[PDB]
């Protein structure tokens, strides 16, 4: 038992939901208690969706302890009602403690579409694992070896529902691949139907956009479909360049860039940015966004990276490898009190992190920007707001620098009283 107030990540079943809601024509059925539907809210409210997530719960209660029957009707009702191309079934943390076997129950029922069962270790793993696993499982269950499309094409892998800037990152990466002759085959799970998943095999290679929600499924595709997948995530001008280089090697195609709107390199080089130099930054968040943020901070903006860490166990190796290159020991924790402590010890001048760090930042009168989930409604915006590629860099620059000029502004203004 661990006293817990703040949690960076949900239970794994929310990760499952994140894959389901990301897709179309797929119904997720979760065995769980009356009350388990509370996650509904994250999708309809934070992501401001216009449809209930394609998720249904058996919703058992006290009187029901005496329930395998319930999951069966739940699976049945979802098919009858929505006639989806495919389904997935799994257990909530409460139903993890029950007897009922999702695998046995769904094969008993025998429906005219595939039903993928999922293992969700609700007492050992969290949201991201949930999403990686569900996505992986769905892919193993539908991806067939296939003939390569005549034109050069790739898959976008790992874009999910409550993804920090997934919507616009997908838009942005599609653009820069297209500026280089590559057309997108299918994007999964975001936007994909189970039928789209069956057509994955025919792409030449895979863009792994988000390691924590797509890696597993990218590997399966490497052995199962002879599909290589990109290791570099294009956040930051430099990392975007190398990503493009990486694609060149994979495809043989020459690197072609439309930089007519890339304003970050000049902005940062510009005279105004000279006092950014040496500014101490603390960086926290999810493995992927932290690694990218640190390269931008050191090699692109000129901050001193003074602290680096993440909440997701899964990225602890790539992060330690990376942090090492800055003379820094990675901080791996999901205890916001460990972060609060580390920030205080590092005493940065800017903090880059999550909604939580936003708050810590305010507690300590420090400027602050948000770089990764978990995040509130604000950071699911109406305006175009990628993190990847060139517009990504542009956007990043404005977001980070803004709270510094405000700080300088508040300081100076009160200093003239």
């Amino acid at each position: 038992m661990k006293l817990t107030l703040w949690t960076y990540e949900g239970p794994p079943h929310v990760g499952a939901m994140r894959v389901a809601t990301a897709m179309k024509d797929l119904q997720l059925v979760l065995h769980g208690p009356q009350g388990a539907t509370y996650a509904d809210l994250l999708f309809t409210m934070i992501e401001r969706r216009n449809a209930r997530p394609p998720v249904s719960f058996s919703t058992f209660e006290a009187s029901h302890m005496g329930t395998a029957i319930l999951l069966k009707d739940a699976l049945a009702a979802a098919h009858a009602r929505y006639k989806p191309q495919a389904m997935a079934v799994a257990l909530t943390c409460t139903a993890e403690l029950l007897q009922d076997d999702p695998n046995g129950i769904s094969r008993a029922l025998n429906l005219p579409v595939p039903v993928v069962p999922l293992e969700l270790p609700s007492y050992s793993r969290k949201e991201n694992y949930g999403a990686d696993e569900t996505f992986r499982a769905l892919v193993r269950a539908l991806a067939v070896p296939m003939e390569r499309t005549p034109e050069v094409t790739c898959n976008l892998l790992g874009a999910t529902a409550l993804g920090f800037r997934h919507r616009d990152d997908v838009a942005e990466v599609t653009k820069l691949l297209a500026t280089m002759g590559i057309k997108v085959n299918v994007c999964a799970p975001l936007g994909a139907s189970p039928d789209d998943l069956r057509k994955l095999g025919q792409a030449h290679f895979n863009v792994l956009m988000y390691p924590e929600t797509g890696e597993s499924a990218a590997r399966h595709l490497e052995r199962a479909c002879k599909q290589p997948f990109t290791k570099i995530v294009p956040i930051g001008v430099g990392a975007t360049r190398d990503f493009l280089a990486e694609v060149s090697k994979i495809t043989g195609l020459p690197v072609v860039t439309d930089e007519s709107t890339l304003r970050q390199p000049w902005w940062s080089a510009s005279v105004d940015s000279t006092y950014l130099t040496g500014k101490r930054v603390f960086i926290f968040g999810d493995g992927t966004h932290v690694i990218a943020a640190a390269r931008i901070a050191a090699k692109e903006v000129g901050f001193e990276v003074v602290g680096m860490g993440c909440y997701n166990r899964e990225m602890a190796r790539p992060l330690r490898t990376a942090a090492a290159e800055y003379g820094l020991e990675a901080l791996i924790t999901d205890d916001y009190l460990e972060v609060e402590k580390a920030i205080e010890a590092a005493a940065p001048e800017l903090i880059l992190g999550t909604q939580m760090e936003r708050n810590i930042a305010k507690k300590l009168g420090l400027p602050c920007a948000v770089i990764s989930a978990p995040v509130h409604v604000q950071d699911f915006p109406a305006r175009y707001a990628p993190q990847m590629g060139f517009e990504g860099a542009n956007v990043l620059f404005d977001t980070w620098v803004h709270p510094l000029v405000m700080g300088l502004e508040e300081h100076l203004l009160t200093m003239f009283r």
């Binding site: 038992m1 006293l3 239970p11 009356q34 509370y38 509904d40 309809t44």
Partner: protein, 414 residues
Amino acid sequence: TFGCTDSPVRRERGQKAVFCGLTSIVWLHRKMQDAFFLVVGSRTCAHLLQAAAGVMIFAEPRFGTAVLEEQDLAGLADAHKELDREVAKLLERRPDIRQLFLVGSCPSEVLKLDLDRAAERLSGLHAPHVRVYSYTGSGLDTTFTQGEDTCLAAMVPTLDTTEAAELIVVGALPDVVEDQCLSLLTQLGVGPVRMLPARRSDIEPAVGPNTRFILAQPFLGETTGALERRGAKRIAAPFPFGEEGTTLWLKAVADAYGVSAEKFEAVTAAPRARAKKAIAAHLETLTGKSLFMFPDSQLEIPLARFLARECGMKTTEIATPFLHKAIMAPDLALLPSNTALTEGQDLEAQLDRHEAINPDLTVCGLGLANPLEAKGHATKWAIELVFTPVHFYEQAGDLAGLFSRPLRRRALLN
């Protein structure tokens, strides 16, 4: 055309879209300044609290969750020793807390942790400074506001005994509402009067065979039971929403205390006229509009009653997650007799009913609200009605405002 005492209520069971009682901790811990609510449960529970608490989570709130790990499952163990260590760690870094709540979850119940034995031993190890109780807030046994009910009911047995004839107003209300309530009752000459729960642990009420209590919130079945079990007697009354609700509520109390209609109409006419005028501003957009209410809180029947009789709305299907026949009787008596009444629910069934009915305003949870808007239906999210001051006279106009607003916005956006 008004009266629903004899109308058949649809007892429905199936896919349910509701919050668990754990949610109640959110408004509840605010009221009880001395208390801390420790949920023994999973990370799911932690997550829910977080989602449910939005901004509050950053405001060091007096609730938390003892998240069960892998080895707390694996039998035997000191589930109890674990719990104890965390509780000591908690009470130390937090000596302000005077009463501690072990709030049971689904996982904790399915694992059959004896939280009562836990509360017992812990009361021992931390007396006299801290008293520790136990109660269920799980999805298995509790819907949303029902978590308030199970909490208070757990406190009742342990309350001080007395023989004085006193009035207890039961149910956590906003402090402005609580005060207005307290004032009017003093003006009517009823006294002395105390709330359950009280603002601090040291001024909880006493109960005895001569105690009278009246409910401010519909969802207090269990608490009623435990109070009656101690000898206390309820004043039946419809719930104080709107001008009519409040007057009828107050009158029920006055009558039980033998207050002349003299003093009653004196104390009450000013506040009443104020209340009725505030409501008129909304009568415009409200009258004639058909209403649908999904089950969330047990507040739906009396609020449907307020909306029909005082705002001229036409009821449709009014659903509650639980319907106490006796407590709700006053309000059922004044609800329009056409009303299709529902206890529990089967989501997809009820949505088909909704689609068919095509109502002008729908009250529902956040998970339903936007999807319904997208498909053309104006909605009013239920959860606002537990945090906004809505009871009694001064908040009556504001109450009707909660429901006019969405219609006015739907109108204005086209």
